[PDB]
Coordinates of C-alpha atoms and ligand atoms in Angstrom, one line a residue:
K295 CA 0.0 0.0 0.0
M296 CA 2.7 2.4 1.1
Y297 CA 5.0 1.4 -1.8
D298 CA 2.2 2.5 -4.2
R299 CA 2.7 6.1 -3.2
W300 CA 6.4 5.9 -4.0
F301 CA 7.0 3.5 -6.9
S302 CA 5.4 3.3 -10.3
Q303 CA 3.4 0.1 -10.9
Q304 CA 6.2 -0.9 -13.4
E305 CA 8.8 -0.4 -10.6
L306 CA 6.7 -2.4 -8.2
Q307 CA 7.0 -5.4 -10.6
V308 CA 10.7 -5.5 -10.1
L309 CA 11.0 -4.2 -6.5
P310 CA 11.3 -7.4 -4.3
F311 CA 10.0 -5.6 -1.2
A312 CA 6.7 -5.4 -3.1
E313 CA 6.6 -9.2 -3.7
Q314 CA 4.4 -11.5 -1.7
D315 CA 7.1 -13.5 0.1
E316 CA 6.7 -15.0 3.6
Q317 CA 10.4 -15.5 4.1
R318 CA 11.4 -12.0 3.1
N319 CA 8.9 -10.6 5.7
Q320 CA 10.1 -13.0 8.4
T321 CA 13.7 -12.1 7.6
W322 CA 13.0 -8.4 8.1
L323 CA 11.0 -9.0 11.2
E324 CA 14.0 -10.8 12.6
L325 CA 16.5 -8.1 11.5
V326 CA 14.4 -5.3 12.9
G327 CA 13.6 -7.1 16.2
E328 CA 17.3 -8.0 16.7
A329 CA 18.4 -4.5 16.0
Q330 CA 16.0 -3.1 18.6
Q331 CA 17.1 -5.8 21.1
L332 CA 20.7 -4.7 20.8
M333 CA 19.7 -1.1 21.1
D334 CA 17.6 -1.9 24.2
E335 CA 20.7 -3.5 25.8
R336 CA 22.8 -0.4 24.9
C337 CA 25.0 -2.5 22.6
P338 CA 27.7 -0.4 21.1
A339 CA 27.9 -0.3 17.3
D340 CA 31.4 -1.8 17.3
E341 CA 30.3 -5.0 19.1
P342 CA 30.6 -8.1 16.9
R343 CA 26.9 -8.9 17.0
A344 CA 26.0 -5.4 15.9
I345 CA 28.7 -5.5 13.1
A346 CA 27.4 -8.9 11.9
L347 CA 23.8 -7.7 12.0
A348 CA 24.6 -4.5 10.0
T349 CA 26.5 -6.5 7.4
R350 CA 23.4 -8.7 7.0
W351 CA 21.1 -5.7 6.9
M352 CA 23.1 -4.3 3.9
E353 CA 23.1 -7.7 2.1
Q354 CA 19.4 -8.0 2.5
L355 CA 18.6 -4.4 1.6
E356 CA 20.6 -4.7 -1.6
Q357 CA 18.8 -8.0 -2.4
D358 CA 15.4 -6.5 -1.7
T359 CA 16.0 -3.4 -3.8
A360 CA 17.2 -5.7 -6.7
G361 CA 20.5 -3.9 -6.6
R362 CA 19.0 -0.7 -7.8
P363 CA 20.4 2.3 -6.0
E364 CA 17.5 4.5 -7.2
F365 CA 15.2 2.1 -5.2
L366 CA 17.4 2.6 -2.2
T367 CA 17.2 6.4 -2.5
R368 CA 13.4 6.0 -3.0
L369 CA 13.2 4.2 0.4
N370 CA 15.2 6.9 2.1
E371 CA 12.8 9.6 0.6
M372 CA 10.0 7.4 2.0
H373 CA 11.5 7.2 5.5
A374 CA 11.8 11.0 5.7
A375 CA 8.3 11.9 4.3
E376 CA 6.0 8.9 5.1
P377 CA 4.5 9.3 8.6
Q378 CA 4.3 6.2 10.7
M379 CA 7.1 4.3 9.1
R380 CA 8.0 3.2 12.6
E381 CA 4.5 1.8 13.1
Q382 CA 4.4 0.1 9.7
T383 CA 7.9 -1.5 9.5
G384 CA 9.5 -1.2 12.9
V385 CA 12.4 0.7 11.3
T386 CA 13.2 4.0 13.0
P387 CA 15.7 6.7 12.1
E388 CA 17.6 5.9 15.3
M389 CA 17.8 2.2 14.2
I390 CA 19.1 3.2 10.8
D391 CA 21.7 5.4 12.6
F392 CA 22.8 2.3 14.6
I393 CA 23.0 0.1 11.6
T394 CA 24.9 2.8 9.7
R395 CA 27.5 3.1 12.5
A396 CA 27.8 -0.7 12.9
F397 CA 28.4 -1.1 9.2
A398 CA 31.0 1.6 9.3
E399 CA 32.7 -0.3 12.1
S400 CA 32.8 -3.4 9.8
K401 CA 34.9 -1.5 7.3
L402 CA 37.0 0.4 9.9
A403 CA 37.9 -3.0 11.4
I404 CA 39.5 -3.8 8.0
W405 CA 41.1 -0.4 7.2
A406 CA 42.8 -0.7 10.6
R407 CA 45.2 -3.2 9.0
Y408 CA 46.0 -0.8 6.1
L409 CA 46.3 2.5 7.8
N410 CA 48.4 4.1 10.6
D411 CA 46.7 5.3 13.8
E412 CA 46.4 8.9 12.5
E413 CA 44.9 7.9 9.2
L414 CA 42.4 5.5 10.8
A415 CA 41.3 8.1 13.3
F416 CA 40.8 10.7 10.6
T417 CA 38.6 8.2 8.7
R418 CA 36.7 7.1 11.7
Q419 CA 35.7 10.7 12.3
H420 CA 35.1 11.8 8.7
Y421 CA 33.6 8.6 7.2
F422 CA 30.2 9.9 8.1
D423 CA 30.6 13.5 6.9
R424 CA 29.2 12.9 3.4
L425 CA 28.2 9.2 3.7
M426 CA 24.6 10.0 2.8
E427 CA 25.5 11.4 -0.6
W428 CA 26.8 8.1 -2.0
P429 CA 23.5 6.4 -3.1
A430 CA 22.6 9.4 -5.3
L431 CA 26.1 9.2 -6.9
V432 CA 25.9 5.4 -7.4
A433 CA 22.5 5.8 -9.1
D434 CA 24.0 8.4 -11.5
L435 CA 27.0 6.2 -12.2
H436 CA 24.7 3.3 -13.0
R437 CA 22.8 5.6 -15.4
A438 CA 26.0 6.9 -17.1
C439 CA 27.2 3.3 -17.6
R440 CA 23.7 2.2 -18.8
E441 CA 23.5 5.1 -21.3
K442 CA 27.0 4.4 -22.6
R443 CA 28.1 7.9 -21.5
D444 CA 31.7 8.7 -22.5
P445 CA 33.9 8.8 -19.3
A446 CA 35.8 11.7 -20.8
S447 CA 32.7 13.8 -21.5
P448 CA 32.0 16.8 -19.3
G449 CA 29.2 15.1 -17.4
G450 CA 31.3 11.9 -17.1
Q451 CA 34.1 14.0 -15.6
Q452 CA 31.5 15.7 -13.3
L453 CA 30.8 12.2 -11.9
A454 CA 34.5 11.5 -11.5
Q455 CA 34.9 14.8 -9.6
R456 CA 31.9 13.9 -7.4
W457 CA 33.5 10.6 -6.6
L458 CA 36.8 12.3 -5.7
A459 CA 35.1 14.7 -3.4
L460 CA 33.3 11.9 -1.5
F461 CA 36.4 9.8 -1.5
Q462 CA 38.7 12.5 -0.2
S463 CA 36.0 13.4 2.4
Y464 CA 36.7 10.1 4.2
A465 CA 40.2 9.3 3.1
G466 CA 41.8 12.8 3.3
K467 CA 43.9 14.6 0.7
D468 CA 47.3 12.8 1.2
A469 CA 48.3 10.9 -1.9
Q470 CA 50.1 8.2 0.0
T471 CA 47.1 7.6 2.3
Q472 CA 44.8 7.5 -0.7
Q473 CA 46.9 4.8 -2.3
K474 CA 46.4 2.7 0.8
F475 CA 42.6 3.0 0.5
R476 CA 42.7 2.0 -3.2
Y477 CA 44.9 -1.0 -2.4
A478 CA 42.6 -2.1 0.4
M479 CA 39.7 -1.9 -2.1
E480 CA 41.5 -4.2 -4.5
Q481 CA 42.3 -6.7 -1.8
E482 CA 39.2 -6.7 0.5
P483 CA 35.9 -7.8 -1.0
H484 CA 33.9 -6.6 2.0
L485 CA 34.9 -3.0 1.4
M486 CA 32.6 -2.8 -1.6
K487 CA 29.6 -4.2 0.3
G488 CA 26.8 -1.8 1.0
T489 CA 27.6 0.2 -2.2
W490 CA 25.2 -1.1 -4.8
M491 CA 28.2 -1.0 -7.1
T492 CA 28.8 -3.6 -9.8
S493 CA 32.0 -4.6 -11.6
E494 CA 30.6 -3.0 -14.8
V495 CA 29.8 0.3 -13.1
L496 CA 33.1 0.3 -11.2
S497 CA 35.0 -0.2 -14.5
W498 CA 33.2 2.8 -16.0
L499 CA 33.9 4.9 -12.9
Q500 CA 37.6 3.9 -12.9
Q501 CA 37.9 4.9 -16.6
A502 CA 36.4 8.3 -15.7
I503 CA 38.8 8.6 -12.7
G504 CA 41.7 7.7 -15.1
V505 CA 40.8 10.5 -17.4
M506 CA 40.6 12.9 -14.5
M507 CA 44.0 11.9 -12.9
Ligands
FWE272 C1 35.5 2.2 -1.1 O1 36.0 3.4 -1.8 C2 36.0 3.3 -3.2 C3 34.8 3.2 -3.9 N1 33.6 3.4 -3.2 C4 32.3 3.3 -3.7 O2 32.1 3.1 -4.9 C5 31.2 3.4 -2.8 C6 29.8 3.5 -3.2 C7 28.8 3.6 -2.3 C8 29.0 3.7 -0.9 N2 27.9 3.8 0.0 C9 26.6 3.6 -0.3 O3 26.2 3.3 -1.4 C10 25.6 3.8 0.7 C11 24.5 3.0 0.9 C12 23.5 3.2 1.9 C13 23.6 4.3 2.8 N3 22.7 4.6 3.8 C14 21.3 4.9 3.5 O4 20.9 4.8 2.4 C15 20.5 5.2 4.7 N4 19.4 4.2 4.8 C16 19.5 2.9 5.0 O5 20.6 2.4 5.1 C17 18.3 2.0 5.1 C18 18.2 0.9 5.9 C19 17.1 0.1 5.9 C20 15.9 0.4 5.1 N5 14.8 -0.4 5.1 C21 13.5 -0.2 4.5 O6 13.4 0.8 3.8 C22 12.3 -1.1 4.7 C23 11.1 -0.7 4.1 C24 12.3 -2.2 5.5 C25 11.3 -3.1 5.9 C26 11.2 -3.7 7.2 C27 10.2 -4.6 7.5 C28 9.2 -4.9 6.6 O7 8.2 -5.8 7.0 C29 9.2 -4.4 5.4 C30 10.2 -3.5 5.0 C31 16.1 1.5 4.3 C32 17.2 2.3 4.3 C33 21.5 5.0 5.8 C34 22.9 4.7 5.1 N6 24.0 4.6 5.7 C35 24.7 5.1 2.6 C36 25.7 4.9 1.6 C37 30.3 3.6 -0.5 O8 30.5 3.7 0.9 C38 30.8 4.9 1.3 C39 31.3 3.5 -1.4 O9 32.6 3.5 -0.7 C40 34.9 3.1 -5.3 C41 36.2 3.0 -5.9 C42 37.4 3.0 -5.2 C43 38.7 2.9 -6.0 O10 39.7 2.9 -5.3 O11 38.7 2.9 -7.2 C44 37.3 3.2 -3.8 O12 38.4 3.2 -3.0

């Protein structure tokens, strides 16, 4: 019912959330209930149960948006504008904040092996500065790749510049530090979880980055 106000009926045919599926509903009942239980117990976001829960949240959310970042952004629009999303789904803004921070910890736990203490502390602080702007960029990268946009075109370079701004926001401006992050990406599959990125779109982006650099 709620999805009808936010997705076209064509989109509803491909949005798994809108499927009749008992297991999907049970899965989210568990994921929401377990998040609230950890929060009730004042579980820190860097506790292993929270990290594991948040990793599972992101896997499930990408599955149930059919890997479409524009469907993820649509859900976030919904959460802000639909009243009673707490009452309908159990998902609260405070719960998303918890999952967001726990998922960040899942990546900071890996970056710790690639960064020195100063770099890691910088990223722990600034990872959240512009985190919320990534889904919109990912959707635009998907569209550029789908439309066969030239990575060297002005608007392709606009996308590369946007990536750099968001990347430097969390990584800093030091070239040697940035090299560590890009090496970590190459070597750690988990660091591209919760991104809605595909190998095809990543390849397009890295071509656009190559032109820019
Ligand atoms: C690693 O760096 C790189 C990169 N990187 C990247 O490409 C990159 C790309 C993207 C990202 N990030 C993201 O995409 C990115 C994703 C997501 C968020 N997000 C959000 O959307 C916000 N809401 C949610 O989460 C949220 C959670 C739950 C729901 N549930 C529901 O609605 C419903 C209806 C449930 C339901 C329940 C019960 C029912 O009964 C029924 C229903 C809804 C919403 C909060 C956060 N946090 C934020 C961000 C990213 O991370 C920063 C990246 O790094 C590339 C190349 C190199 C190189 O070297 O070449 C490199 O180094």
